[PDB]
PDB file of C-alpha atoms in Angstrom:
ATOM      1  CA  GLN A 485     -28.532  84.238  24.924  1.00  0.00           C
ATOM      2  CA  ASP A 486     -31.396  84.927  22.576  1.00  0.00           C
ATOM      3  CA  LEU A 487     -29.052  84.508  19.596  1.00  0.00           C
ATOM      4  CA  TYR A 488     -28.488  80.888  20.751  1.00  0.00           C
ATOM      5  CA  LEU A 489     -32.142  80.641  21.835  1.00  0.00           C
ATOM      6  CA  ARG A 490     -33.785  81.676  18.567  1.00  0.00           C
ATOM      7  CA  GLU A 491     -31.235  79.698  16.598  1.00  0.00           C
ATOM      8  CA  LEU A 492     -31.877  76.543  18.602  1.00  0.00           C
ATOM      9  CA  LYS A 493     -35.669  77.070  18.515  1.00  0.00           C
ATOM     10  CA  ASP A 494     -35.643  77.243  14.755  1.00  0.00           C
ATOM     11  CA  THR A 495     -33.135  74.397  14.782  1.00  0.00           C
ATOM     12  CA  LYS A 496     -35.478  72.235  16.831  1.00  0.00           C
ATOM     13  CA  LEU A 497     -38.786  73.234  15.257  1.00  0.00           C
ATOM     14  CA  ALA A 498     -38.009  73.587  11.564  1.00  0.00           C
ATOM     15  CA  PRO A 499     -37.488  69.844  11.169  1.00  0.00           C
ATOM     16  CA  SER A 500     -39.905  69.002  13.991  1.00  0.00           C
ATOM     17  CA  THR A 501     -42.635  68.630  11.332  1.00  0.00           C
ATOM     18  CA  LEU A 502     -40.306  65.994   9.853  1.00  0.00           C
ATOM     19  CA  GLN A 503     -39.630  64.108  13.121  1.00  0.00           C
ATOM     20  CA  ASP A 504     -42.250  64.809  15.761  1.00  0.00           C
ATOM     21  CA  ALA A 505     -45.454  65.192  13.711  1.00  0.00           C
ATOM     22  CA  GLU A 506     -45.341  63.238  10.424  1.00  0.00           C
ATOM     23  CA  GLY A 507     -46.739  66.002   8.175  1.00  0.00           C
ATOM     24  CA  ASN A 508     -44.025  64.740   6.008  1.00  0.00           C
ATOM     25  CA  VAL A 509     -42.048  67.734   4.605  1.00  0.00           C
ATOM     26  CA  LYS A 510     -42.886  71.245   3.306  1.00  0.00           C
ATOM     27  CA  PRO A 511     -39.583  72.408   1.639  1.00  0.00           C
ATOM     28  CA  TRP A 512     -38.513  69.069   0.035  1.00  0.00           C
ATOM     29  CA  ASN A 513     -40.477  68.569  -3.187  1.00  0.00           C
ATOM     30  CA  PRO A 514     -40.139  64.752  -3.344  1.00  0.00           C
ATOM     31  CA  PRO A 515     -41.917  62.943  -0.481  1.00  0.00           C
ATOM     32  CA  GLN A 516     -39.824  61.729   2.435  1.00  0.00           C
ATOM     33  CA  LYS A 517     -41.746  58.677   3.697  1.00  0.00           C
ATOM     34  CA  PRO A 518     -41.195  56.789   0.382  1.00  0.00           C
ATOM     35  CA  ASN A 519     -37.425  57.303   0.638  1.00  0.00           C
ATOM     36  CA  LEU A 520     -36.031  55.678   3.802  1.00  0.00           C
ATOM     37  CA  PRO A 521     -38.804  53.639   5.603  1.00  0.00           C
ATOM     38  CA  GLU A 522     -40.458  52.383   2.440  1.00  0.00           C
ATOM     39  CA  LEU A 523     -37.878  52.086  -0.342  1.00  0.00           C
ATOM     40  CA  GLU A 524     -34.673  51.886   1.660  1.00  0.00           C
ATOM     41  CA  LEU A 525     -36.240  49.807   4.468  1.00  0.00           C
ATOM     42  CA  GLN A 526     -35.886  46.795   2.193  1.00  0.00           C
ATOM     43  CA  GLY A 527     -32.601  48.466   1.143  1.00  0.00           C
ATOM     44  CA  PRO A 528     -30.336  45.985   2.967  1.00  0.00           C
ATOM     45  CA  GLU A 529     -32.268  43.119   1.383  1.00  0.00           C
ATOM     46  CA  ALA A 530     -32.036  45.094  -1.834  1.00  0.00           C
ATOM     47  CA  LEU A 531     -28.321  45.473  -1.141  1.00  0.00           C
ATOM     48  CA  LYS A 532     -27.758  41.859  -0.003  1.00  0.00           C
ATOM     49  CA  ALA A 533     -29.081  38.645  -1.510  1.00  0.00           C
ATOM     50  CA  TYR A 534     -32.811  38.006  -1.151  1.00  0.00           C
ATOM     51  CA  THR A 535     -34.534  34.688  -0.154  1.00  0.00           C
ATOM     52  CA  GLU A 536     -31.370  32.696   0.332  1.00  0.00           C
ATOM     53  CA  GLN A 537     -28.896  34.709   2.355  1.00  0.00           C
ATOM     54  CA  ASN A 538     -31.194  36.938   4.425  1.00  0.00           C
ATOM     55  CA  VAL A 539     -33.722  34.124   4.954  1.00  0.00           C
ATOM     56  CA  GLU A 540     -30.422  32.306   5.688  1.00  0.00           C
ATOM     57  CA  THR A 541     -31.343  28.772   4.331  1.00  0.00           C
ATOM     58  CA  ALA A 542     -31.329  26.447   7.300  1.00  0.00           C
ATOM     59  CA  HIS A 543     -30.424  23.610   4.964  1.00  0.00           C
ATOM     60  CA  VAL A 544     -30.053  19.869   5.417  1.00  0.00           C
ATOM     61  CA  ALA A 545     -26.660  18.443   4.526  1.00  0.00           C
ATOM     62  CA  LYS A 546     -26.338  15.765   1.843  1.00  0.00           C
ATOM     63  CA  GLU A 547     -26.046  12.489   3.764  1.00  0.00           C
ATOM     64  CA  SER A 548     -22.872  10.996   2.316  1.00  0.00           C
ATOM     65  CA  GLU A 549     -22.799   7.200   2.546  1.00  0.00           C
ATOM     66  CA  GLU A 550     -20.487   4.216   2.926  1.00  0.00           C
ATOM     67  CA  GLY A 551     -19.251   1.832   0.182  1.00  0.00           C
ATOM     68  CA  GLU A 552     -22.855   0.654  -0.445  1.00  0.00           C
ATOM     69  CA  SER A 553     -22.511  -2.671   1.374  1.00  0.00           C
ATOM     70  CA  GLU A 554     -20.648  -4.682  -1.282  1.00  0.00           C
ATOM     71  CA  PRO A 555     -17.591  -6.523   0.019  1.00  0.00           C
ATOM     72  CA  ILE A 556     -17.334  -9.520  -2.145  1.00  0.00           C
ATOM     73  CA  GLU A 557     -16.899  -8.714  -5.866  1.00  0.00           C
ATOM     74  CA  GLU A 558     -14.444  -5.923  -4.974  1.00  0.00           C
ATOM     75  CA  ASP A 559     -12.670  -7.408  -1.928  1.00  0.00           C
ATOM     76  CA  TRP A 560     -11.619 -10.369  -4.060  1.00  0.00           C
ATOM     77  CA  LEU A 561     -10.320  -7.867  -6.651  1.00  0.00           C
ATOM     78  CA  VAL A 562      -8.479  -5.948  -3.936  1.00  0.00           C
ATOM     79  CA  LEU A 563      -7.009  -9.247  -2.709  1.00  0.00           C
ATOM     80  CA  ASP A 564      -5.796 -10.307  -6.182  1.00  0.00           C
ATOM     81  CA  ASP A 565      -4.466  -6.864  -7.025  1.00  0.00           C
ATOM     82  CA  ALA A 566      -2.665  -6.934  -3.651  1.00  0.00           C
ATOM     83  CA  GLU A 567      -1.128 -10.232  -4.763  1.00  0.00           C
ATOM     84  CA  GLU A 568      -0.025  -8.355  -7.876  1.00  0.00           C
ATOM     85  CA  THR A 569       1.493  -5.553  -5.810  1.00  0.00           C
ATOM     86  CA  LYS A 570       3.372  -8.017  -3.637  1.00  0.00           C
ATOM     87  CA  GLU A 571       4.553  -9.608  -6.873  1.00  0.00           C
ATOM     88  CA  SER A 572       5.866  -6.145  -7.726  1.00  0.00           C
ATOM     89  CA  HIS A 573       6.932  -5.579  -4.099  1.00  0.00           C
TER      90      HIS A 573
ATOM     91  CA  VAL B 835     -11.679   6.254   0.360  1.00  0.00           C
ATOM     92  CA  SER B 836     -11.182   3.029   2.261  1.00  0.00           C
ATOM     93  CA  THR B 837      -8.563   0.940   3.921  1.00  0.00           C
ATOM     94  CA  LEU B 838      -6.291  -0.752   1.386  1.00  0.00           C
ATOM     95  CA  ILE B 839      -4.979  -4.155   2.422  1.00  0.00           C
ATOM     96  CA  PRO B 840      -1.540  -5.339   1.221  1.00  0.00           C
ATOM     97  CA  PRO B 841       0.071  -6.210   4.574  1.00  0.00           C
ATOM     98  CA  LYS B 842      -1.305  -9.744   4.874  1.00  0.00           C
ATOM     99  CA  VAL B 843      -1.541 -11.151   1.342  1.00  0.00           C
ATOM    100  CA  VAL B 844       1.360 -13.512   1.913  1.00  0.00           C
ATOM    101  CA  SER B 845      -1.058 -16.442   1.992  1.00  0.00           C
ATOM    102  CA  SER B 846      -1.213 -17.096  -1.754  1.00  0.00           C
ATOM    103  CA  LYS B 847       2.019 -15.184  -2.311  1.00  0.00           C
ATOM    104  CA  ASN B 848       4.455 -17.849  -1.000  1.00  0.00           C
ATOM    105  CA  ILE B 849       4.121 -20.065  -4.072  1.00  0.00           C
ATOM    106  CA  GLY B 850       4.827 -17.520  -6.761  1.00  0.00           C
ATOM    107  CA  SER B 851       8.138 -15.968  -5.709  1.00  0.00           C
ATOM    108  CA  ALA B 852      11.383 -17.302  -7.091  1.00  0.00           C
ATOM    109  CA  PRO B 853      13.305 -18.464  -3.959  1.00  0.00           C
ATOM    110  CA  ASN B 854      10.258 -20.505  -2.942  1.00  0.00           C
ATOM    111  CA  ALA B 855      11.421 -23.104  -5.465  1.00  0.00           C
ATOM    112  CA  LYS B 856      14.928 -23.150  -3.937  1.00  0.00           C
ATOM    113  CA  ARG B 857      13.408 -23.328  -0.423  1.00  0.00           C
ATOM    114  CA  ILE B 858      11.139 -26.296  -1.271  1.00  0.00           C
ATOM    115  CA  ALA B 859      14.010 -27.864  -3.145  1.00  0.00           C
ATOM    116  CA  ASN B 860      16.510 -27.897  -0.338  1.00  0.00           C
ATOM    117  CA  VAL B 861      14.041 -28.749   2.443  1.00  0.00           C
ATOM    118  CA  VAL B 862      13.735 -31.942   0.385  1.00  0.00           C
ATOM    119  CA  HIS B 863      17.488 -32.093  -0.185  1.00  0.00           C
ATOM    120  CA  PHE B 864      18.373 -31.908   3.521  1.00  0.00           C
ATOM    121  CA  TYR B 865      16.240 -34.464   5.301  1.00  0.00           C
ATOM    122  CA  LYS B 866      17.435 -37.887   4.055  1.00  0.00           C
ATOM    123  CA  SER B 867      21.136 -37.012   3.929  1.00  0.00           C
ATOM    124  CA  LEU B 868      23.081 -39.093   6.503  1.00  0.00           C
ATOM    125  CA  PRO B 869      24.680 -36.708   9.045  1.00  0.00           C
ATOM    126  CA  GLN B 870      28.442 -37.155   9.276  1.00  0.00           C
ATOM    127  CA  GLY B 871      29.647 -39.981   7.064  1.00  0.00           C
ATOM    128  CA  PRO B 872      27.350 -42.296   9.016  1.00  0.00           C
ATOM    129  CA  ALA B 873      26.325 -45.786   7.870  1.00  0.00           C
ATOM    130  CA  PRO B 874      29.770 -45.972   6.174  1.00  0.00           C
ATOM    131  CA  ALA B 875      30.329 -49.742   6.562  1.00  0.00           C
ATOM    132  CA  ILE B 876      34.085 -49.102   6.404  1.00  0.00           C
ATOM    133  CA  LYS B 877      34.981 -52.791   6.475  1.00  0.00           C
ATOM    134  CA  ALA B 878      33.597 -55.478   4.195  1.00  0.00           C
ATOM    135  CA  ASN B 879      35.054 -58.821   3.276  1.00  0.00           C
ATOM    136  CA  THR B 880      34.168 -60.924   0.228  1.00  0.00           C
ATOM    137  CA  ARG B 881      37.713 -62.463  -0.214  1.00  0.00           C
ATOM    138  CA  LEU B 882      38.635 -59.521  -2.512  1.00  0.00           C
ATOM    139  CA  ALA B 883      36.930 -56.472  -0.961  1.00  0.00           C
ATOM    140  CA  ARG B 884      39.957 -56.114   1.307  1.00  0.00           C
ATOM    141  CA  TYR B 885      42.011 -55.741  -1.903  1.00  0.00           C
ATOM    142  CA  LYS B 886      39.833 -52.793  -2.927  1.00  0.00           C
ATOM    143  CA  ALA B 887      39.884 -51.333   0.609  1.00  0.00           C
ATOM    144  CA  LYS B 888      43.664 -51.467   0.717  1.00  0.00           C
ATOM    145  CA  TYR B 889      44.201 -50.418  -2.926  1.00  0.00           C
ATOM    146  CA  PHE B 890      41.192 -48.863  -4.643  1.00  0.00           C
ATOM    147  CA  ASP B 891      39.650 -46.285  -2.314  1.00  0.00           C
ATOM    148  CA  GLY B 892      40.117 -42.536  -2.522  1.00  0.00           C
ATOM    149  CA  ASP B 893      42.876 -42.581   0.114  1.00  0.00           C
ATOM    150  CA  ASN B 894      45.551 -44.954  -1.344  1.00  0.00           C
ATOM    151  CA  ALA B 895      44.884 -44.589  -5.078  1.00  0.00           C
ATOM    152  CA  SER B 896      48.477 -45.313  -6.093  1.00  0.00           C
ATOM    153  CA  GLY B 897      49.326 -47.189  -9.270  1.00  0.00           C
ATOM    154  CA  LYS B 898      50.894 -50.183  -7.490  1.00  0.00           C
ATOM    155  CA  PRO B 899      48.081 -52.707  -8.242  1.00  0.00           C
ATOM    156  CA  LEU B 900      48.689 -51.895 -11.897  1.00  0.00           C
ATOM    157  CA  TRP B 901      52.306 -52.751 -11.005  1.00  0.00           C
ATOM    158  CA  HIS B 902      50.928 -55.906  -9.353  1.00  0.00           C
ATOM    159  CA  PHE B 903      48.769 -56.529 -12.414  1.00  0.00           C
ATOM    160  CA  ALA B 904      51.845 -55.873 -14.566  1.00  0.00           C
ATOM    161  CA  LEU B 905      53.667 -58.564 -12.581  1.00  0.00           C
ATOM    162  CA  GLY B 906      50.575 -60.701 -13.038  1.00  0.00           C
ATOM    163  CA  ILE B 907      51.163 -60.739 -16.764  1.00  0.00           C
ATOM    164  CA  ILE B 908      54.813 -61.394 -15.912  1.00  0.00           C
ATOM    165  CA  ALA B 909      53.466 -64.251 -13.816  1.00  0.00           C
ATOM    166  CA  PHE B 910      51.183 -65.477 -16.599  1.00  0.00           C
ATOM    167  CA  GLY B 911      52.882 -65.975 -19.960  1.00  0.00           C
ATOM    168  CA  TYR B 912      56.286 -66.930 -18.559  1.00  0.00           C
ATOM    169  CA  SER B 913      54.747 -70.017 -17.029  1.00  0.00           C
ATOM    170  CA  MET B 914      53.167 -70.590 -20.407  1.00  0.00           C
ATOM    171  CA  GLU B 915      56.738 -70.271 -21.647  1.00  0.00           C
ATOM    172  CA  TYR B 916      57.356 -73.314 -19.510  1.00  0.00           C
ATOM    173  CA  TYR B 917      54.337 -74.871 -21.153  1.00  0.00           C
ATOM    174  CA  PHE B 918      55.439 -73.943 -24.675  1.00  0.00           C
ATOM    175  CA  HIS B 919      59.048 -72.905 -25.210  1.00  0.00           C
TER     176      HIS B 919
END
């Protein structure tokens, strides 16, 4: 069907200079290559956070420590305050 | 943030509490007490201790020696009657 044929040939070929050969675009007055693959290519890193979330920050955890190796001057206080609790107990 | 420790602080606790005084009082009160009325020495004789044992213990305790002592004064001055009048 040459209706279908000529329709599909113009359908294929009229944007084929926008897809097959990159002679960017004749009817569109703004250029097409600085829309999606140049501006909007960094789109998702213009739409999400840059240099922390997309670079993802493989980050070292803060090494949380013990009671800093001091028994004496606080274990005696814990012992005497425990005497005071057992007074109150 | 750490293990708290009042299960085992009874070391220097057992002086301060109030029945500790009663406990250390009656462990001293109970050792030297004779068991069951022992060492009673229920008989003694000094020519008049039998008079006390028959008359002046907790068991007899009746006023009769007074009566005896009353008769003693009846025994005393009446003879002095025979010395005087």
